[PDB]
Design an enzyme around this catalytic site. Sequence first.
Site, PDB file in Angstrom:
ATOM      1  N   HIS B  41       0.612  -1.338   0.479  1.00  0.00           N
ATOM      2  CA  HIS B  41       0.604   0.150   0.348  1.00  0.00           C
ATOM      3  C   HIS B  41       1.097   0.575   0.088  1.00  0.00           C
ATOM      4  O   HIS B  41       0.561   1.915   0.126  1.00  0.00           O
ATOM      5  CB  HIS B  41      -0.848  -0.080   0.895  1.00  0.00           C
ATOM      6  CG  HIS B  41      -0.494   0.485   2.792  1.00  0.00           C
ATOM      7  ND1 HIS B  41      -0.460  -0.852   3.447  1.00  0.00           N
ATOM      8  CD2 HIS B  41      -0.041   1.825   2.957  1.00  0.00           C
ATOM      9  CE1 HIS B  41      -0.345  -0.088   4.797  1.00  0.00           C
ATOM     10  NE2 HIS B  41      -0.106   1.309   4.386  1.00  0.00           N
ATOM     11  N   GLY B 143       2.688   7.113   9.750  1.00  0.00           N
ATOM     12  CA  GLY B 143       3.529   6.723   9.075  1.00  0.00           C
ATOM     13  C   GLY B 143       4.674   5.276   9.765  1.00  0.00           C
ATOM     14  O   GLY B 143       5.841   5.246   9.165  1.00  0.00           O
ATOM     15  N   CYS B 145       3.040   2.237   8.928  1.00  0.00           N
ATOM     16  CA  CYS B 145       3.666   0.902   8.179  1.00  0.00           C
ATOM     17  C   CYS B 145       4.846  -0.297   8.003  1.00  0.00           C
ATOM     18  O   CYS B 145       6.010   1.224   7.638  1.00  0.00           O
ATOM     19  CB  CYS B 145       2.428   1.362   7.013  1.00  0.00           C
ATOM     20  SG  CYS B 145       0.757   1.245   7.874  1.00  0.00           S
TER      21      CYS B 145
END
Lengths: 304, 304
Positions: B41, B143, B145
């Site tokens: 993603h 942020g 991830c």
Amino acid sequence: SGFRKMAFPSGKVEGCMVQVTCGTTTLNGLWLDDVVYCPRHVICTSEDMLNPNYEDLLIRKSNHNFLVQAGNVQLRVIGHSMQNCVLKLKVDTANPKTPKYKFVRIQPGQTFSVLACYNGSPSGVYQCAMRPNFTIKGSFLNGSCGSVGFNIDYDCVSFCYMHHMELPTGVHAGTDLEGNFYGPFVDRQTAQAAGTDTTITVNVLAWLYAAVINGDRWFLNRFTTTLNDFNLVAMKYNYEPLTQDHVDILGPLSAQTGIAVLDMCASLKELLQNGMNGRTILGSALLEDEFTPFDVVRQCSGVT
Amino acid sequence: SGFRKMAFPSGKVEGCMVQVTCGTTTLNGLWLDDVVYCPRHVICTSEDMLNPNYEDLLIRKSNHNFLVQAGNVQLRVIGHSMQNCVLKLKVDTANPKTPKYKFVRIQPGQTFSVLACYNGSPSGVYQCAMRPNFTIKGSFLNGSCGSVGFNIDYDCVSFCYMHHMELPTGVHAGTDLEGNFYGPFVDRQTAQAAGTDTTITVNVLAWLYAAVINGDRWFLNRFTTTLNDFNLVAMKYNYEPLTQDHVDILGPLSAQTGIAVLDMCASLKELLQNGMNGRTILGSALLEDEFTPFDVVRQCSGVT
Ligand SMILES: Cc1c([C@@H](C)C(=O)O)ccc2c1[nH]c1ccc(Cl)cc12
Ligand SMILES: Cc1c([C@@H](C)C(=O)O)ccc2c1[nH]c1ccc(Cl)cc12
């Protein structure tokens, strides 16, 4: 979202841990530049710990009796000296992994990370608070002495604790990196009991702010209080008295959530008086006091 | 003595964290050998996350659109491929700090350490458990991830988790290092609700054993039970059913303390039925389920 009991990344501290052996005793040391710091009780047997005369025991020790091993390589000890309850072993090689560092003496209520070590090898990392009675509730087994507590400000490690003792009650005592014990404790196997372990009120309020930010809001009520009124209840519940300095420190959290500090005190007052009624706050069934207002801000903003 | 929610030392994992940017999205990557792993993603905007067609979005991306920064030095991306929900970016330089490692897919009830990161920089480390509903209760902000979960067996890091999503309920979802989500979750901003978050019974019993070893024994009673009888109570309290496999795993703790596993089940049964009555176990007012029997043994023996 989410709020966890979080420790600092331990890499910078793992690169400093060494093993120190004197006779039959092995514990941990902290290697910064060309100095290895370790509890002076490394020179003691368990028999000596009953009534150790450290100056006398140290006369029988030479540089070559302190065996320092970093990983699997031995370090050469070229000098040694006792500063309060720590020994400083001067080695011939500066630690190549020495981070930017400071030695700070913390106040009760301040939190820090501990890197628990055995034989100079890191086993785990957890978050602590210096209790108002100057003990810490750690996880330390035999061989863990010399494990250190620390905080990190971007790339600078501020070392604040070195583990030395476990009191008969199972709580822990230790020193700053200048070898001065926190509180009234001594490096002697004797009856040493801790005073009242009061709750760090400002930390509990900071954690209630973290809870509101993360969505747990059930405990918020329609009341307010004053510092004096709140403190009558804090006294009854063995909580630290809240000062105007604490109110000022909670200023940013108050601003971010729009909940006045005295309104959060009134929510805390009702929680103390009424209990949790089987409910939880941030997955806890008790009021957590081992997050400072700085820790809450840092975790809620993602500081690295 | 003392028992803490302890994470593994994070140094070996800190040496692997990089920053990955694709367009306006920046998250974390894991650099092992000449490969950087990150959530696929990273190619999405928040608009794309509503209904992303990953194969289609990826057609518009070339190696040079994936900006990988390790510390303050840029890495050259020479290849990229999507494996399930992770992107693998082949870089021209093997990570010099790559530890011995494995990719393992854990079972619910298993615990691990998470190194929370922002812009490739480690911010903190905490201990987690994969919940029986395949969510984790972490601390992740925008942020974070690409932050990873892991366990360490002496010098080998077994990576088991990569952070991808925060569900509308504030719980977290992610994948193993092959990019397969734990549970039924997908990398799409959509209504995804978690199932029942049951309690990991075997972990609670392991923690009751840790409590006995560390001196907290008030909850021990004069009763015993059977697995079937215990499970009737576990069912009522949303606890995982206890199996003979769990009884076998608790064998060493049972042996060390001399408390039969079914006797500890009977103590747990009374605690469920009667509550804590305002008391605590290892400083907790609830039954802790994020220590496995292996974690209790490791912490109670000082494994490094
Ligand atoms: C820095 C230091 C230490 C450390 C342990 C310290 O005291 O900080 C120990 C011993 C010595 C030392 N500098 C020296 C210079 C001359 C001589 Cl003869 C001895 C020493
Ligand atoms: C290991 C690997 C990757 C990584 C991302 C992987 O798929 O593991 C990506 C791309 C390539 C790659 N080896 C190659 C050899 C030839 C060509 Cl033309 C491309 C690639």
